[PDB]
Amino acid sequence: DFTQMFYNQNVKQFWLPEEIALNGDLLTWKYLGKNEQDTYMKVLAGLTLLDTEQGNTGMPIVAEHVDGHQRKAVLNFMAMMENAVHAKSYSNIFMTLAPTETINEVFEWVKQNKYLQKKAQMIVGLYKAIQKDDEISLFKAMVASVYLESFLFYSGFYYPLYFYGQGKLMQSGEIINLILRDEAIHGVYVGLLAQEIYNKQTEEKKAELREFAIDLLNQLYENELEYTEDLYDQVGLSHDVKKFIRYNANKALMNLGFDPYFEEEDINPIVLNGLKATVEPLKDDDFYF
Amino acid sequence: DFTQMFYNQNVKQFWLPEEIALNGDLLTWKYLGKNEQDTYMKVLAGLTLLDTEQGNTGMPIVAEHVDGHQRKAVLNFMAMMENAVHAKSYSNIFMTLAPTETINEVFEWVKQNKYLQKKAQMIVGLYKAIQKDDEISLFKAMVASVYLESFLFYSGFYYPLYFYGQGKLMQSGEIINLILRDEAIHGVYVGLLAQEIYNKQTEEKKAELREFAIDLLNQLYENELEYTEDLYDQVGLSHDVKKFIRYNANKALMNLGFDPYFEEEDINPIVLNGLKATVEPLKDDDFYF
Amino acid sequence: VPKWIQLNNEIMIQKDGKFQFDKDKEAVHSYFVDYINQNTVFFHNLKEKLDYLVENQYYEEEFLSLYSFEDIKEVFKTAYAKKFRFPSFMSAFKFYNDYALKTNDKKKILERYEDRISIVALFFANGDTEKAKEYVNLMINQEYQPSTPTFLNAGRKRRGELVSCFLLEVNDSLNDISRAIDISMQLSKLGGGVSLNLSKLRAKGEAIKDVENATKGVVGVMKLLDNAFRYADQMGQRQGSGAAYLNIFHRDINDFLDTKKISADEDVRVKTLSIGVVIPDKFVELAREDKAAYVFYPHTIYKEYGQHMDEMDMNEMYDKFVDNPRVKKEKINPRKLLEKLAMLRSESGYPYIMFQDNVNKVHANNHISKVKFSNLCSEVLQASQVSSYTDYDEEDEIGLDISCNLGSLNILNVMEHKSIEKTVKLATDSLTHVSETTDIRNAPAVRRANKAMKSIGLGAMNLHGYLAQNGIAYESPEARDFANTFFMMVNFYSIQRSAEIAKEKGETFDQYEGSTYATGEYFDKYVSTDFSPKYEKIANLFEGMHIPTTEDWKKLKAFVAEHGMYHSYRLCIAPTGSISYVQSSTASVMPIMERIEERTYGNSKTYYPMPGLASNNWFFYKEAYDMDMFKVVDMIATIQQHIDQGISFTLFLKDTMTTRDLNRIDLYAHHRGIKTIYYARTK
Amino acid sequence: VPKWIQLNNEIMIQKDGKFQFDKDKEAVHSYFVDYINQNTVFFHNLKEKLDYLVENQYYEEEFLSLYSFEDIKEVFKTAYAKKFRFPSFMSAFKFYNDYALKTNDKKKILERYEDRISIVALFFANGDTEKAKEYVNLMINQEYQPSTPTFLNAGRKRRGELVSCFLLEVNDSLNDISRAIDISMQLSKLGGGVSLNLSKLRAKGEAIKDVENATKGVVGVMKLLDNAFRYADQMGQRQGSGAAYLNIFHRDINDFLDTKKISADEDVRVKTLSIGVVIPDKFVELAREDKAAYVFYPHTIYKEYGQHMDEMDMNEMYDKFVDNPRVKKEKINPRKLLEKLAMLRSESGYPYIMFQDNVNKVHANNHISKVKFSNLCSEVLQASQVSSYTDYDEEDEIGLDISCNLGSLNILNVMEHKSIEKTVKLATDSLTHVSETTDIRNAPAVRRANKAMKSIGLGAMNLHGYLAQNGIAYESPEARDFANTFFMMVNFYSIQRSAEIAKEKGETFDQYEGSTYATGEYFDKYVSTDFSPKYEKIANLFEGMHIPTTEDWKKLKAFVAEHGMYHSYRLCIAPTGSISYVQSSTASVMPIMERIEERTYGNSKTYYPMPGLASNNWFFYKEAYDMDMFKVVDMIATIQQHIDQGISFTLFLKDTMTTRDLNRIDLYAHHRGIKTIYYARTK
Ligand SMILES: Cc1cn([C@H]2C[C@H](O)[C@@H](COP(=O)(O)OP(=O)(O)OP(=O)(O)O)O2)c(=O)[nH]c1=O
Numbered sequence A, B: 001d002f003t004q005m006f007y008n009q010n011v012k013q014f015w016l017p018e019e020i021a022l023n024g025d026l027l028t029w030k031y032l033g034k035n036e037q038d039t040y041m042k043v044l045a046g047l048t049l050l051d052t053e054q055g056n057t058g059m060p061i062v063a064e065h066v067d068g069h070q071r072k073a074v075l076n077f078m079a080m081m082e083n084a085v086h087a088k089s090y091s092n093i094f095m096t097l098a099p100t101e102t103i104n105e106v107f108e109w110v111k112q113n114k115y116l117q118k119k120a121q122m123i124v125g126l127y128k129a130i131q132k133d134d135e136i137s138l139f140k141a142m143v144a145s146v147y148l149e150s151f152l153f154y155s156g157f158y159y160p161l162y163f164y165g166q167g168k169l170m171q172s173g174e175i176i177n178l179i180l181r182d183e184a185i186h187g188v189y190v191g192l193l194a195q196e197i198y199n200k201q202t203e204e205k206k207a208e209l210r211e212f213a214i215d216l217l218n219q220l221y222e223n224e225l226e227y228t229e230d231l232y233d234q235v236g237l238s239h240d241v242k243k244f245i246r247y248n249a250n251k252a253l254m255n256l257g258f259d260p261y262f263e264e265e266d267i268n269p270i271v272l273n274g275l276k277a278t279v280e281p282l283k284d285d286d287f288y289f
Numbered sequence C, D: 001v002p003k004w005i006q007l008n009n010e011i012m013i014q015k016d017g018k019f020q021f022d023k024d025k026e027a028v029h030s031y032f033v034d035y036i037n038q039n040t041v042f043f044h045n046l047k048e049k050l051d052y053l054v055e056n057q058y059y060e061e062e063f064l065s066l067y068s069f070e071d072i073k074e075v076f077k078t079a080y081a082k083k084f085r086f087p088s089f090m091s092a093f094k095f096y097n098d099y100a101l102k103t104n105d106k107k108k109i110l111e112r113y114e115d116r117i118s119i120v121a122l123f124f125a126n127g128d129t130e131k132a133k134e135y136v137n138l139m140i141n142q143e144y145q146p147s148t149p150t151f152l153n154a155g156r157k158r159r160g161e162l163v164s165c166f167l168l169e170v171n172d173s174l175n176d177i178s179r180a181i182d183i184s185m186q187l188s189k190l191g192g193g194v195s196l197n198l199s200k201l202r203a204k205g206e207a208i209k210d211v212e213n214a215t216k217g218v219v220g221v222m223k224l225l226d227n228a229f230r231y232a233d234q235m236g237q238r239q240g241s242g243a244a245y246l247n248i249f250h251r252d253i254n255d256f257l258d259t260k261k262i263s264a265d266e267d268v269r270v271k272t273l274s275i276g277v278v279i280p281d282k283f284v285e286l287a288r289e290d291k292a293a294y295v296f297y298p299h300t301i302y303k304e305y306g307q308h309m310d311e312m313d314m315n316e317m318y319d320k321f322v323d324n325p326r327v328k329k330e331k332i333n334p335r336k337l338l339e340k341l342a343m344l345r346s347e348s349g350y351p352y353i354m355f356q357d358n359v360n361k362v363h364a365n366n367h368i369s370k371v372k373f374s375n376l377c378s379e380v381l382q383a384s385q386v387s388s389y390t391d392y393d394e395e396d397e398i399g400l401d402i403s404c405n406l407g408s409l410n411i412l413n414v415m416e417h418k419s420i421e422k423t424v425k426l427a428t429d430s431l432t433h434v435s436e437t438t439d440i441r442n443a444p445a446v447r448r449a450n451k452a453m454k455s456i457g458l459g460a461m462n463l464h465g466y467l468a469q470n471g472i473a474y475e476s477p478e479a480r481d482f483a484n485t486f487f488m489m490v491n492f493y494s495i496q497r498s499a500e501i502a503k504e505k506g507e508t509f510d511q512y513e514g515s516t517y518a519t520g521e522y523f524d525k526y527v528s529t530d531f532s533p534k535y536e537k538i539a540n541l542f543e544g545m546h547i548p549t550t551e552d553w554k555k556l557k558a559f560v561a562e563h564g565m566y567h568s569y570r571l572c573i574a575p576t577g578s579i580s581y582v583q584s585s586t587a588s589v590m591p592i593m594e595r596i597e598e599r600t601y602g603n604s605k606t607y608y609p610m611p612g613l614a615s616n617n618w619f620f621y622k623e624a625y626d627m628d629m630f631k632v633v634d635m636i637a638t639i640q641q642h643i644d645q646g647i648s649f650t651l652f653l654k655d656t657m658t659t660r661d662l663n664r665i666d667l668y669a670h671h672r673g674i675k676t677i678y679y680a681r682t683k
């Protein structure tokens, strides 16, 4: 009942980072403190890693196991967006704002950062555990994918949105909003596929799947807290970002058909402001008048 | 040396089925004989069936085994074009020209056809034989992929190009020309990835891979001749189609860095009408000797 | 925002359900009293003004030296005595932006409308004070409008040529192709539009001195000409405009047409070169019978017969070419070629269509040559003889390359003044003077044909404006009746003026004695058929103005037979693009495209209602896209029968109509005697 | 797979750890016996063959009629008396695929090597039987090789011109630009490469007769010339090749260089137009001191001084240009321009570098003009005068456009025969004959300069082959010693033969009296310095051959003063691309690129070891890329001091070499007196 409308929405949302000129951010970037620039680079690098794996691994593997040519076409399109559009856009931002050495250093930093490695290990592990014709392993990977789309990106998205909302780094911010618009529909779509599998189960099996989903969310959440503190303490925003990730965790649960898990909190209003002619053959009678 | 350049060319060639209005083809379709309509339907179904294998298996399997983030992104983009763009385009052409019952029957016929099946299963067999961390099996699959993209499609493309060059079925011919333009670049790109593997091999292993490629080409070519007579004798075109197959076989070989196998031949004119080392500054004392 | 363009935008603000058309009068009044009078350089007396303009290289001293300053003062008084006022903001804006003389830094305004008209009149009269006053009266009444080159450059020192349409015949040689490129760049440098006939050039795959498949065809010459026109672009303000013409029976016709396809490659497509296709009646007959047509290799025909293919009659030699084994031919489908033409015109507006037998069955100078191609505006239809440009050490055989001076009668103002005869004769005199004072010293064939043929083009505009302001629909039979009578009278008085000029100067145009004027065959339909209006409504429009009868035409025929004709060609109806605003007239004899025309100049948006548009004649100003193209073809064919050259005939197509409808319009135009079809404009 | 192709492929099959070099003799023997003798048309007698060739439009009856048939028979006897054998398969293959006369359907072979040599000799002698026999002995011994145009076309009815290098000056006018395009197409039609000097053309954004900022610059002319060369593609046989030269102080130099970037826009990029940059010593001095330099608008300089910017000495005029407020200029960084040049040469091999002051400090005809640019191969360095092509009616002012006739001595065969003097003098006679018999009817300046200057180019080849076959490293000081002595002897005997021809004909070249030959300034370094070999090994190479001494040079100076000099220019070392295979020689004076040449012809791959390559001399055949480019510069500068024109100097670079390394090579070439740099070839 939904794939065709998602197909149409995904293809109509198609974009490339080159559509957005980035040289306009040069001055507001220059004006940020060293702490702010550091957090910003690292935040986008963490996002780049997530999209790299979502494009290389997550979306293609889910596409492989989901039945139906139209469902596969949507998932293939989403996969392309992840690595050919989203992951690449971050390099466009980096290449504009930062010198090569700072770019090299931040990519080295992703490799050695323990929270980013842990979250990649956990998510990709679940993708690679999918067994052919085994719907339960597929469900588990789809939960992981929804958590990546609708929860994990948001510790990263906070900062570009926070600046956009203050009228700073607005070209980079425009790119990020386009990425976010895509991930929102990706999270809903994968959520609907996960619910399909969940709804086939016995009540006993469903109870176990909810346990899996909640245990996984809590494990990812605890890691994300440490990641958030590590990045945001130097810019004074860790508590604010934490409220934002809890907000989005609830959206991820809802995408999976589950009740919200965290209590509602006031999000920084700045971040909320951050959001041919037809050919007809000649007849014989056409030559006489 | 080449992936970013191909990335650029691929994304700038992006298109959607909806861009070409198909209904005006009915004004020339109605004037074709039964044999012409039959051949066109059968050719179209042949292309559709082969392209589906490439979208569901060929491109995604190669993307899975190739190392490199940028290569995986380009390959993902190509897989997207197969599943999201090409497949919808073929379906659109069919739905415009034939009623539902006729489409189902043509696909039943072509699905049972000996020559279409022989080539489809030969290609799919090589994709299924790729082994993790074995570059030889990957190379063999890449050869199969290049043969599909740059050679096997062309016994089929001939007919729409033949009409397109005569002013008949111009809307569907425009679509086919866009598809063909994508398959050409797909073949060239996968060809470069195959040459990379080939160049890492010993001289004895190279000679062995050359023998594999020529042997495979021979098997496919002999089946193409039979496929061609089966479809085109009823419309009197087989002689010229055979010249077009050999010409495209030579292009496929050149994509794989191999010499042409067949002597140069002229092609039907109607179908033709259808078709930095390192910058270093001068630091003084270089002007004195 | 400027006050005048703010007032001009109040036209679209609908008050009481009607457009505020009177705002344009306020718009032009504000435009003048806030920009023009402020930016106008004013001198104490006209003597100081003329001395300032001559000394600072603005005017030419030679033409002003033929009059005593009292005579120049009298001419300027005659211009200013009319107290001409522009009726709309667009008229004055276009004049003071395109034709009014400005200082060397483009800062202030030196010429008013009266000053420009007086200078043009003194240039035309060539020393005659009374003739200068007559020209002043003619132009200040806006009965006659000299073309953009003449009106813009008459009497200016640093000026281009007064002729902007040139037609070149290219012979089948590398020397002739190089000379064609050189002459095209020279004429584009002068500001003129250049048309080239590429039919004599041998097709792709022909031999160049016994080595076969050596010739690149007409498309290589097309690329050469396209880059030559891109190079000679005159600062790029008006980039070099060229046209190429190919006979439909040329083998390269499909490649010639493929240069305009949207999917054309950069190594084939030409961008600055318009294309026209010359279609003999043989091709239309072959397509009508659905027979198999043949395109021919021109060099084989030239080798076999000693003449170029386009110099021969295809309706009598096509079968001989097909049956000749030594002639090389390629099989084509004529109906497929027609459909390709229609598709190309739908998608790009190209090619121009010339119906060769429609041009030549009424052509008066077939003894000199048949008309083989048209100009860039697709309305000049004159005999041409190809030149033979030889090696550097050898003498060149100079042929006849076409060029005519353009000028338009304002049908509304001519009919209001009841002055068809006087306007036609004075315009003929002015065009004759422009022809006599033109000397192109880098195009030998253009110069020779200008001296020999003495061809002029006297067009008309404001036909639709006059009809709509007189309660006549453009498609109505009464409109065609008026056009018939009006253009018969224009032809009569142009022939009379040409004969009088020949009698006075004692000379006719070269090879006049072989023309149909000399034999008297030209006057057959004029001495046999009466062209008086058939409707009482139209007959009252000509009340107070004598309409020549059959007896008058017999007397004129005797006069021409006894004195000859000075001009080989006299009448051609050009598009008249930008001078139509200045004259407050509809463009040419074609129907209007928009009732209120919206344009953006710089960062300012302004609207131009059609001249005389109101609520009492809103529906008589029917847009060209909403009317039947068959009735427009009927109107143009009615006018064409009195015009010796062609008419720039634009086809106005809706999006709904297919290529079959465009082909039907083309075939009906060919059936009705249409000589050329200019553009396929789609809305 | 052909038997000879298999045998040639067995060279790479290593037997006993060595290449089977002897298989190429088997390969050529099999090639002949199986293909050539089968496909060679044989006639009962030479008379029948000659009659068939003249009557079937293969030969020219004019030059053959100059001899009785007995003399022609004896000439053919002399050619076949040598029993010449091609040493390698590639020599015979290249001759019988490029130069041997074939039937009109290109199926059989009419001419053997001996027949071609006999016909060329009979054409050279122009009626002298003993002279024809001398030419036969010279060419069958392969001591002298006429250039590809001369060797291929001499004595052929359907032949191109015997000259293929032309140098045109383009004046700053539309007439001159159109004439340049015409002449370029006419010369490319003849099959010759055309070089155009664009330095006189005014830059982009210059005024055209009071209309400022109207000129498209040299890039519009570049596009015109590129399309002209693409159209004039030698009857679709070989792609039209042309070169454009611009002074580095021209304002459009950066636009000129941007036409060769890989990222160049399609409206800027030129495909078939090679580019060369002319660099005066002033630019190198400015870059050396890192002072910011100025590029000048040429038309401002012409208006201020009445002379073209490239007609003046930039060393004295640069400060005056900079300090002149009426001369327009923009600041540039000369070091950045040098780095851009090096980057462009690394990426695409362009531009050619011509060191203007290196050429003109030793130029013997500076009174006629300075050398402003070079040819398409960067070795022709002669004085030129720009032509003033006026309007069609006016008379043109014809200048001097460079075109010299090419010939190559085989250094190995000349050295082994001990015939430097005889080969040089006979080659001079043959080049003189080719110069006299050349008449070009569509390039008036080229024809005038050919008649007046009588300039020839006598090159040399097989330098590396001769050195490696004699156990001398190319970079060794002994190699430079041999080059010094050999080319001093070549210059001595070419000057002696030119003075002898002047004495015989009683005429010198035009404006000889102002040359350094007339004043004796040319002979200063020859009457002051001894150029005998400084090494015993090199002095042994010249045993049995009189090396000219200081007294001999004084006698030659007196002889030239008494009798004059017939040729303004005599020696230029062309690349000698395809004739090197036929002669079994290394190309020009350049070192070999590869020891064994791997090439694919048709569907079969071929192997060509360098001539004389073996196990003993394997490491003397050092590849050019493995060489030190500084030592190659030293060798070419040693040769350049005895060559009056330039030498085609290709830079052979490794992939590891940076932009700084290429710039260092260019600056050392400039320091060492190198006149031109041809190509930057990267491995
Ligand atoms: C020289 C040349 C000619 N052409 C074409 C254009 C001309 O229309 C046509 C005639 O060239 P010509 O200049 O007339 O060549 P030609 O006189 O030597 O050959 P012929 O005896 O046949 O007259 O050849 C090319 O297409 N490319 C070329 O390079």
Ligand SMILES: Nc1nc2c(ncn2[C@H]2C[C@H](O)[C@@H](COP(=O)(O)OP(=O)(O)O)O2)c(=O)[nH]1
Pocket: C041, C042, C043, C044, C045, C046, C047, C049, C073, C076, C077, C078, C080, C081, C115
């Ligand atoms: N004074 C003046 N007259 C101009 C100018 N441009 C055109 N004219 C026209 C207006 C008159 O019709 C005519 C004579 O003007 P004038 O020389 O002032 O004469 P007058 O008013 O003393 O008779 O010249 C102009 O710049 N100044």
Ligand SMILES: Nc1nc2c(ncn2[C@H]2C[C@H](O)[C@@H](COP(=O)(O)OP(=O)(O)O)O2)c(=O)[nH]1
Pocket: D041, D042, D043, D044, D045, D046, D047, D049, D073, D076, D077, D078, D080, D115
């Ligand atoms: N017979 C013959 N001789 C040829 C041909 N092409 C070149 N030649 C050369 C070989 C000899 O050197 C020379 C004379 O040959 P000939 O006419 O057979 O002479 P002869 O030996 O009968 O006196 O011409 C050729 O085709 N036939």
Ligand SMILES: [Mg+2]
Pocket: C172, C173, C174
């Ligand atoms: Mg000719």
Ligand SMILES: [Mg+2]
Pocket: D172, D173, D174
């Ligand atoms: Mg000039």
Ligand SMILES: [Mn+2]
Pocket: A051, A054, A081, A082, A086, A087, A179, A182, A183
């Ligand atoms: Mn993403």
Ligand SMILES: [Mn+2]
Pocket: A054, A078, A082, A149, A182, A183, A186, A187
């Ligand atoms: Mn996503």
Ligand SMILES: [Mn+2]
Pocket: B051, B054, B081, B082, B086, B179, B183
């Ligand atoms: Mn596909």
Ligand SMILES: [Mn+2]
Pocket: B054, B082, B149, B182, B183, B186
């Ligand atoms: Mn594909």
